[PDB]
């Protein structure tokens, strides 16, 4: 699995992801290239339609569930706690997905964009220290999401 | 090897699986042959008959449960979200199952067809880089759907079956 | 080792016909039990607070599967479903040593799972029945009960 | 871990465990010595207070007593004695019998059969209530008991 | 590095007597602690009732059972007797061990219970599949009237009643 | 990568005093952090309630207890004292570490709690089968009235009240 990279813009704190993937921020895990992006080691997101469970037809509108990414303790974490606790809305959250390319390197092939996100949950876990880093799960609702397969040219979107 | 390939046609978006298994869509995992089919790494489906008591035998209408497949982030995924969000009815979903053949190659031996499918759930999960435990693995997209009719076909050996998922 | 299941249905006849032939299961073909389903798992519970619980076996996508769905969805009762259990014997081969048969079985659940995002897809078949008999064929002991 | 051997006597079917651990019954896992006892690969048992005894259970394979065990379960046959002999590695090379658990007029309450597919040999969990249990550390002299 | 526990009840005399001898355990015989139960596991919780939203402090300390896990040793029938008869155990004393400078084991911590009562005995024997060193396990859970914690090597006591 | 926690109590003073010294933890002695507890695990959640099939932000944020896991060290009896007596802890300070360029551990993050209260202490010792060559674990959970987060290496801070 290749890591994804997330650029976060805040209404109060500006470029929250600024310097997130630098040596000062993440250490020997430094990634040359995405200095102003958080490196996401996990992502999860669900979208659902309630169903009757008997006829199989929907029993209500679609429901968006929070978008989540997991990172380590990087330079953005104190800023993310500020946003969570102060209710700061983020006008843009943009995740860039990567895969192994022909040349051998990673290529950006997919994009997920959230508009006016709000952080609803931050979960920190340090696995037992006796190659892994502490984990920080950031969950977010939003007002609109757009999906883009950049390499093949397909996009879609929806409001919350 | 043993992934399945799924052709999806939508009543609004046409051939949703178009080009899903091409190099631009999935990269090094592109499979020449199934260009207009989604590559599915997992599949799950349940059909059940109520028993309802210590009585112990069938007691009510059978219930079909949603059919689901899991794929990676391919060219159709934005289209699939469009289908989920707009309630787009999918007139045909066709699953082709594969196994190792006599000669050593992959063989198509089973087919599952859905008629008037509707996507009810899309769950995206990316496992983490856990020091070569998830080297082979990729982000996964579990797509679930209900339908109005299913056909089961063992193409290699001749046997077929079918059933309707009644509305009421 | 796998178990082998002969299934006879009151509407579709020998449901197990050709289940374990190369055309049905591929390189997993077993050239002994052509007309039996090869079961990779089996589970069954009988309990008192007697209540029998459904008998279950798990197979892959073999040629009887479309017929098993027909039985389930149509409520076809199966007059006999017979399990033959095997073990490796003294010399070197597998020997049949146990049989469980069900009488007037009914399929109540079919759960299909494809794994591994080097094994095979799995299909769990669960069944009620009206009578079950057990018989350690190798040792002479038998038992039976009604539902 | 070494397996245990259980001698089960039933009020209707007699020595249920008779020949349970012989060549014809369990195959290459045949170990001569406990021919008239079932070879148990697992055991679990709980007693708790808010006394409450919970069922004693053992796990075996498809052996010659299993069809008889289903008869006991299905008819409610009271089994006047159930005796488990526990074994451990000794100073020398063989296993030594060091513990015994004895139940009086047990009743089988549950039989759960499971067969897995990197594994070996299907498992059958037999659970039973009882009217009295005796615990005995054979090697050291201490005993205990209680009624249900 | 297992713990070693001494148990006395008001009716049965030294319940842990000879618990860790060959006659009691066998090839796992470990000299020295002959009259103590060798515990392979221990678990214990103490808690304060919460009130999550507008949080911190909805109640009075709650003690939960102290439990240890051993094998089938000579004290087990004695423990079942204690469980079944409701025998009050005036003292249960746990000695914790760690790697020392010398190469041997050093006793550095003690947990004491006063008027303990056995609340649960769960016996589980894992499948012979391999597990060349696994053995039967016995989880014994105890209530008590007072617990004392002592870091013997460094000092520092603490205690509380249930 | 283990973290080190300095704990100050309003009744017992420097509770973490000598927690990581030889008398306290043995050959796991750590010169540098003598007056800090060594933490193997830490867990902490902060959340905002939301209207599920509606707009997101409803209701007050909810801070949840901060937790750390250590072994049986010199501070444990004091930590039990704080739990059972409700001792308010004016400062809890966590220093997080990572591998540096030079090869040594570097301090890069700090988490501080103000007026902490211990709400839960869970002691669990694993079964010494292979695969368990490490020590007993003690989960200490605390609520607090203020927390400060600091990325020391990069210059970011944030904070909140409870």
Structure tokens at F54: 């509606």
| Spatial CA neighbour of E116 closest among E33, E10, E3, E2 | E10
Compute how many other C-beta atoms are within 10 angstroms of the C-beta atom of residue F49. 15
> What does the alpha-carbon distance between residue D52 and residue E121 come to, in Å, rounded to a whole number?
11
Length of chain B (residues): 168
Burial class of residue C146 in the structure, from the number of CB atoms within 10 Å of its CB (0-12 exposed, 13-18 middle, 19+ buried): exposed
A79: chain F residues, CB-CB within 8 Å: 156, 158
Its domain, for residue E11, covers 1-162
| In A127-143, beta strands by DSSP E | 135-141
Number of folded domains that form chain F: 1
> Is there a contact between F123 and F141 (Cβ–Cβ < 8 Å)?
no
> What does the alpha-carbon distance between residue A22 and residue E147 come to, in Å, rounded to a whole number?
50
| Spatial CA neighbour of B97 closest among B1, B3, B7 | B3
Taking CA–CA distances from A155, the nearest residue in chain B reads B78
E123: chain D residues, CB-CB within 8 Å: 43-46
> What does the alpha-carbon distance between residue A107 and residue A149 come to, in Å, rounded to a whole number?
12
| In chain B, beta strands by DSSP E | 4-10, 14-15, 38-40, 42-48, 63-64, 67-71, 90-100, 106-126, 140-146, 149-153, 160-164
Residue F26: phi and psi, rounded to 5, are 90, -145
> What does the alpha-carbon distance between residue F149 and residue E45 come to, in Å, rounded to a whole number?
29
Long-range CB pairs of B52-61 (<8 Å, 24+ gap) are B54/C51, B56/C51, B56/C52, B56/C128, B56/C147, B57/C106, B57/C128, B58/C75, B58/C106, B58/C108, B58/C128, B61/B166, B61/B168
> Is there a contact between E138 and E37 (Cβ–Cβ < 8 Å)?
no
CB within 8 A of B17, min separation 6: which ones?
B6, B7, B8, B9, B36, B37, B38, B76
D45: chain E residues, CB-CB within 8 Å: 122-123
Q: Dmax of chain B from CA atoms?
A: 56
Burial class of residue E133 in the structure, from the number of CB atoms within 10 Å of its CB (0-12 exposed, 13-18 middle, 19+ buried): exposed
> Is there a contact between E1 and F128 (Cβ–Cβ < 8 Å)?
yes
- CB contacts < 8 A, C to D, total 90
D137: chain E residues, CB-CB within 8 Å: 24, 72-74, 76-77
| Spatial CA neighbour of E131 closest among D86, F135, D41 | D41
Residue A158 CA to chain centroid, in angstroms? Answer: 17
Compute how many other C-beta atoms are within 10 angstroms of the C-beta atom of residue F134. 15
List the alpha helices (DSSP H) in chain D: 23-26, 66-75
Contact E136 D1 (CB under 8 A): yes
Cα→Cα distances F162→A88, B65, C103, F117, Å: 18, 46, 66, 12
Contact D62 C140 (CB under 8 A): no
Write down the residue that tokens 């929070």 correspond to: A66
Cα→Cα distances A103→A100, B134, D18, Å: 8, 21, 70
> Is there a contact between D17 and D29 (Cβ–Cβ < 8 Å)?
no
Helix, strand, coil percentages, rounded to 5, for chain B:
10, 45, 45
Chains contacting E with at least 3 CB pairs below 8 Å? D, F
| Spatial CA neighbour of E111 closest among E145, E65, E70, E157 | E157
Taking CA–CA distances from D119, the nearest residue in chain E reads E129
Structure tokens at D59: 């796990």
> What does the alpha-carbon distance between residue E37 and residue F49 come to, in Å, rounded to a whole number?
49
CA dihedral A51, A57, A58, A64 (to 10 degrees): 70
| Spatial CA neighbour of F108 closest among F121, F98, F116, F117 | F98
Host H or E run for residue B26: helix B23-26
> What does the alpha-carbon distance between residue F94 and residue D17 come to, in Å, rounded to a whole number?
62
Contact D115 C143 (CB under 8 A): no
Compute how many other C-beta atoms are within 10 angstroms of the C-beta atom of residue E99. 15
Host H or E run for residue E110: strand E105-125
Residue E79 CA to chain centroid, in angstroms? Answer: 12
DSSP notation for chain D = -PPEEEEEEETTTEETTTTTTSHHHHGGG--TT-TTSEEESEEEEEEE---EE--EEEEE-S-TTHHHHHHHHHHT--EEEEEEEEEEE-SSSSEEEEEEEEEEEEEEEEEEEEE-----S-EEEEEEE-SEEEEEETTT--EEEEE-
Q: How far is B157 from chain C (nearest CA, A)?
A: 6
Host H or E run for residue A82: helix A77-86
Query: 3-class SS at C10?
Result: coil
Chains contacting C with at least 3 CB pairs below 8 Å? B, D
Compute how many other C-beta atoms are within 10 angstroms of the C-beta atom of residue A104. 6
Partner residues linked to E158 by β-bridges: E149
Compute how many other C-beta atoms are within 10 angstroms of the C-beta atom of residue C30. 15
Chain A touched by B14 (CB under 8 Å): no
Chain B touched by A134 (CB under 8 Å): no
Cα→Cα distances B35→A101, B15, B39, B141, Å: 19, 12, 9, 19
> What does the alpha-carbon distance between residue F74 and residue A55 come to, in Å, rounded to a whole number?
63
CB within 8 A of E142, min separation 6: which ones?
E65, E66, E67, E89, E92, E113, E116, E117, E118, E119
Sign of CA dihedral B152, B156, B157, B158: positive
> Is there a contact between F72 and E152 (Cβ–Cβ < 8 Å)?
no
C117: chain B residues, CB-CB within 8 Å: 41-42, 70, 137-138, 140
Structure tokens at B35: 């260009």
Q: How far is A25 from chain B (nearest CA, A)?
A: 19
CB within 8 A of F48, min separation 6: which ones?
A84, A87, A118, A119, A120, A121, F56, F57, F59, F61, F62
Which of F128, F144, F145 is opposite residue E40, by nearest beta carbon? F128
Chain F touched by E57 (CB under 8 Å): yes
Sign of CA dihedral D15, D21, D23, D24: positive
The DSSP call for residue D64 is: T
Determination approach: X-ray
Write down the residue that tokens 């020590």 correspond to: F135
Q: What's the number of CA atoms in the CB half-sphere (13 Å) around residue D91?
A: 4
Residue E11 CA to chain centroid, in angstroms? Answer: 19
| Spatial CA neighbour of C97 closest among C139, C138, C133 | C138
Contact E77 D144 (CB under 8 A): yes
> Is there a contact between E92 and E70 (Cβ–Cβ < 8 Å)?
no
Compute how many other C-beta atoms are within 10 angstroms of the C-beta atom of residue C33. 20
Write down the residue that tokens 């695990």 correspond to: F41
F150: chain A residues, CB-CB within 8 Å: 78
| Spatial CA neighbour of E16 closest among E67, E95, E73, E100 | E73
Residue D107: phi and psi, rounded to 5, are -130, 125
Chain E touched by F99 (CB under 8 Å): no
Partner residues linked to B122 by β-bridges: A47, B143
Question: What is the three-state SS of D26-44?
Answer: HHHHCCCCCCCCEEECEEE
Host H or E run for residue A93: strand A89-100
| Spatial CA neighbour of F149 closest among F109, F115, F116 | F109
The DSSP call for residue C26 is: G
Sign of CA dihedral C82, C85, C90, C91: positive
> What does the alpha-carbon distance between residue A66 and residue A5 come to, in Å, rounded to a whole number?
18
> Is there a contact between D114 and C56 (Cβ–Cβ < 8 Å)?
no
Burial class of residue D147 in the structure, from the number of CB atoms within 10 Å of its CB (0-12 exposed, 13-18 middle, 19+ buried): exposed
| Spatial CA neighbour of C65 closest among B111, E125, E32 | B111
D139: chain E residues, CB-CB within 8 Å: 23-24, 26, 74
Chain E touched by D15 (CB under 8 Å): no
CB within 8 A of E118, min separation 6: which ones?
E79, E82, E83, E87, E89, E140, E141, E142
> What does the alpha-carbon distance between residue E157 and residue F16 come to, in Å, rounded to a whole number?
14
| Spatial CA neighbour of A28 closest among A129, A98, A154, A133 | A133
CA angle A105, A107, A113 (to 5 degrees): 150
> What does the alpha-carbon distance between residue C106 and residue A97 come to, in Å, rounded to a whole number?
49
> Is there a contact between D79 and D9 (Cβ–Cβ < 8 Å)?
yes
Radius of gyration of chain F (CA): 17
> What does the alpha-carbon distance between residue B127 and residue A41 come to, in Å, rounded to a whole number?
7
F50: chain A residues, CB-CB within 8 Å: 66, 120, 141
Contact F120 E151 (CB under 8 A): no
Query: Residue A44 sits in a domain of what CATH number?
Result: 2.30.110.20
In chain B, which residues are followed by a C-to-N distance beyond 2.5 Å, i.e. a gap? none
Which of E74, E125, E128 is opposite residue D140, by nearest beta carbon? E74
Q: How far is C92 from chain D (nearest CA, A)?
A: 10
Q: How far is B127 from chain A (nearest CA, A)?
A: 6
Taking CA–CA distances from F148, the nearest residue in chain A reads A78
CB within 8 A of E49, min separation 6: which ones?
E58, E59, E60, E62
Chains B and D touch (3+ CB pairs under 8 A): no
Contact E156 F74 (CB under 8 A): yes
Length of chain A (residues): 160
> What does the alpha-carbon distance between residue E91 and residue E10 come to, in Å, rounded to a whole number?
9
CB within 8 A of A41, min separation 6: which ones?
A3, A70, A71, A72, A135, B128, B129
Strands E13-14 and D52-53: unpaired
Partner residues linked to B43 by β-bridges: B69, C114
> What does the alpha-carbon distance between residue E74 and residue A66 come to, in Å, rounded to a whole number?
57
Q: What's the number of CA atoms in the CB half-sphere (13 Å) around residue E3?
A: 28
Write down the residue that tokens 């104190």 correspond to: A78
Burial class of residue B99 in the structure, from the number of CB atoms within 10 Å of its CB (0-12 exposed, 13-18 middle, 19+ buried): buried
Query: 3-class SS at E132?
Result: coil
Which of B47, B107, B161 is opposite residue C66, by nearest beta carbon? B161
Residue E158 CA to chain centroid, in angstroms? Answer: 18
> What does the alpha-carbon distance between residue F125 and residue E119 come to, in Å, rounded to a whole number?
20
Residue C88: phi and psi, rounded to 5, are -75, 135
CB within 8 A of E50, min separation 6: which ones?
E58, F119
Which of F57, F98, F156 is opposite residue A27, by nearest beta carbon? F98
b/e for C36-59, b at 16 or more Cβ within 10 A?
bbbbbbbbbbbeeeeebebbbbbb
DSSP notation for chain F = --EEEEEEETTTEETTTTTTSHHHHGGG--TT-TTSEEESEEEEEEE--B-TTS-SB-S--EE--EEEEE-S-TTHHHHHHHHHHT--EEEEEEEEEEE-SSSSEEEEEEEEEEEEEEEEEEEEE--------S--EEEEEEE-SEEEEEETTTTEEEEEE-
> What does the alpha-carbon distance between residue C126 and residue C147 come to, in Å, rounded to a whole number?
15
Chain E touched by D41 (CB under 8 Å): yes
> What does the alpha-carbon distance between residue B97 and residue B112 come to, in Å, rounded to a whole number?
8
Cα→Cα distances A49→A62, A141, F159, Å: 4, 17, 38
> What does the alpha-carbon distance between residue A84 and residue C133 come to, in Å, rounded to a whole number?
64
> What does the alpha-carbon distance between residue D79 and residue D129 come to, in Å, rounded to a whole number?
10
> What does the alpha-carbon distance between residue F9 and residue F28 come to, in Å, rounded to a whole number?
25
The DSSP call for residue D2 is: P
Q: Dmax of chain F from CA atoms?
A: 57
| Spatial CA neighbour of E65 closest among E1, E125, E3, E145 | E145
Which of E41, E50, E158 is opposite residue F119, by nearest beta carbon? E50
Q: How far is F41 from chain E (nearest CA, A)?
A: 17
Structure tokens at E27: 């090839």
> Is there a contact between E3 and E39 (Cβ–Cβ < 8 Å)?
yes
> What does the alpha-carbon distance between residue A20 and residue B136 come to, in Å, rounded to a whole number?
27
Partner residues linked to D14 by β-bridges: D10
Compute how many other C-beta atoms are within 10 angstroms of the C-beta atom of residue A154. 24
Write down the residue that tokens 């700061």 correspond to: A88
Partner residues linked to D104 by β-bridges: D81, D132
Write down the residue that tokens 């856990």 correspond to: B130
Cα→Cα distances C93→B146, C3, C54, C84, D136, Å: 47, 15, 31, 15, 42
> What does the alpha-carbon distance between residue A57 and residue B120 come to, in Å, rounded to a whole number?
9
Host H or E run for residue E160: strand E155-161
Chain F touched by A85 (CB under 8 Å): yes
F44: chain A residues, CB-CB within 8 Å: 123-124
Residue B138: phi and psi, rounded to 5, are -135, 160
In chain D, which residues are followed by a C-to-N distance beyond 2.5 Å, i.e. a gap? 50, 117
> What does the alpha-carbon distance between residue E117 and residue E113 come to, in Å, rounded to a whole number?
10
């Amino acid at each position: 699995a290749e890591p994804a990279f997330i650029k976060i813009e805040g209404s109060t704190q500006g470029l929250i992801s600024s310097g997130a993937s630098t040596e000062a921020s993440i250490g020997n895990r430094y990634k040359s290239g995405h200095e102003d992006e958080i490196m996401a080691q996990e992502v999860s997101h669900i979208v659902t339609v309630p169903v009757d469970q008997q006829s199989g037809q929907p029993s209500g509108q679609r429901v968006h569930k929070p978008f989540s990414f997991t990172c380590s303790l990087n330079k953005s974490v104190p800023l993310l706690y500020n946003a969570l606790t102060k209710g700061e809305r983020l006008p843009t959250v943009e995740v860039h997905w990567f895969r192994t390319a022909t040349s051998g390197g990673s290529e950006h092939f997919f994009t997920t964009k959230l508009e006016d996100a709000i952080i609803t949950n931050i979960e920190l876990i340090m696995p037992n220290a006796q190659d892994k880093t502490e984990l920080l799960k950031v969950s977010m609702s939003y007002r609109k999401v757009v999906w883009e397969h950049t390499a093949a040219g397909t996009s879609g979107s929806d409001d919350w």
